[model samples]
Target: GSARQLSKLKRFLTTLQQFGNDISPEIGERVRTLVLGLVNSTLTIEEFHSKLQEATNFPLRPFVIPFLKANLPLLQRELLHAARLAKQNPAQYLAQHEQLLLDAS
Candidate 1:
């Protein structure tokens, strides 16, 4: 179920990449990489949010805002689960949520 949702999100990103004239080549590449990392579960919600902010100065900003808004509930669920596990075992929690830490580096 989660995988399917992630795939849908990837398709949306691809659509933006393919048809958005306002997105530059460099920005497109960044968005592509970000989306790939996201699909692979290699980026935490925070990392995803941070990278998305980098696009705020571009023409894709408006499109991104709604995309993020629509997916907030999904992201919140993931974050809440991670937080719950962290309360039980911080190290194990960190291991499971490695992407969250990796994004900071």
Candidate 2:
């Protein structure tokens, strides 16, 4: 049972996650947990921001931390938009949703 809002949120954020993967696998994992928890509703923005600082320890912090800082805030705004789309239409987007993942890499 795909909760429509959850699916939309997850799909969009997971696509965002791929940007993390682009940076490097190690840093990517940090982003993975970071985004996963955020979308899952397990992590607050404060906690996410706090833990985000920890990412600076990564080898690519100069590129990684700043990139996340800039992009992830935008990510939140878009995710809310995704929520509206999910709510407005009950139709499933399995094909479109999955395409985003494959297309990102």
Candidate 3:
């Protein structure tokens, strides 16, 4: 959840950086990398949710997809890849989640 929040934030920022701009393969790669990092980060769902709630207190613009729409495909692809990785390694998934929780504490 924290990772997803971070991914959303990254997407929002990336969109802001390219508002009204055309999507390119390079931009797609950048977004993919950002999303993958967030998806693969060491954080549990609870930690992520807690951190995101804390972060919401800041005056960040609402992160609607339309605001950062350029890298939708890349984001989707990265998400799919992460899902696949998770499916292939349940222990790794659990480890990452546990590590995230430990780190938050």
Candidate 4:
């Protein structure tokens, strides 16, 4: 199920990359890299915004807001799962799976 979800997200990202390519080769590359960073949890939200601004040379709030709104639900599910795990194992959850806590947050 996670694989399927991730696959859908990747397909969406690829479409975004193509849109960026229509703008310019450099923008296309940046968009692809941005999606990779987002998927890999390598970029902070602020960094994401900054990179997009740099790529477009303008504030793309309209674009950013919708993108985040669409993706936020997926992240919410992950956080909810983490919350349930922590609730079930309060004493050892964080200690044993700190990275899961960090990623969920």
- Per-candidate alpha-carbon RMSD to the true structure: 10.5, 12.1, 11.3, 10.8
Tens digit of lDDT per residue, candidate 3, span 13-88? 4353233124544444443333333445543333433434343335533543342343343343444444465575
Residue 2 in model 2: shift from native, Å?
A: 24
> What tens-digit string does per-residue lDDT give for candidate 4 at 11-66?
45545654777878877767645643454435655666667768875656566645
Best by lDDT: 4
lDDT of each: 0.49, 0.50, 0.41, 0.53
Ordered by TM-score, highest first, the candidates read 4, 1, 2, 3
Candidate 2 Cα misplacement greater than 4 A, ranges: 1-16, 56-105
| Better structure of 1 and 3 per lDDT | 1
Candidate 2 local lDDT, 1-105, one digit each (tens): 324433444455557565777877765776656764554334565566555666635343344434434445445444545445556421122123444343444
Which regions of candidate 3 fall more than 4 Å away from where they truly are?
1-55, 62-67, 88-105
Please report how far candidate 1 places residue 82 from its true position, in Å: 30
Write the number of the candidate with greater TM-score, choosing between 2 and 4.
4
Query: How far off is residue 51 in model 3, in Å?
Result: 15
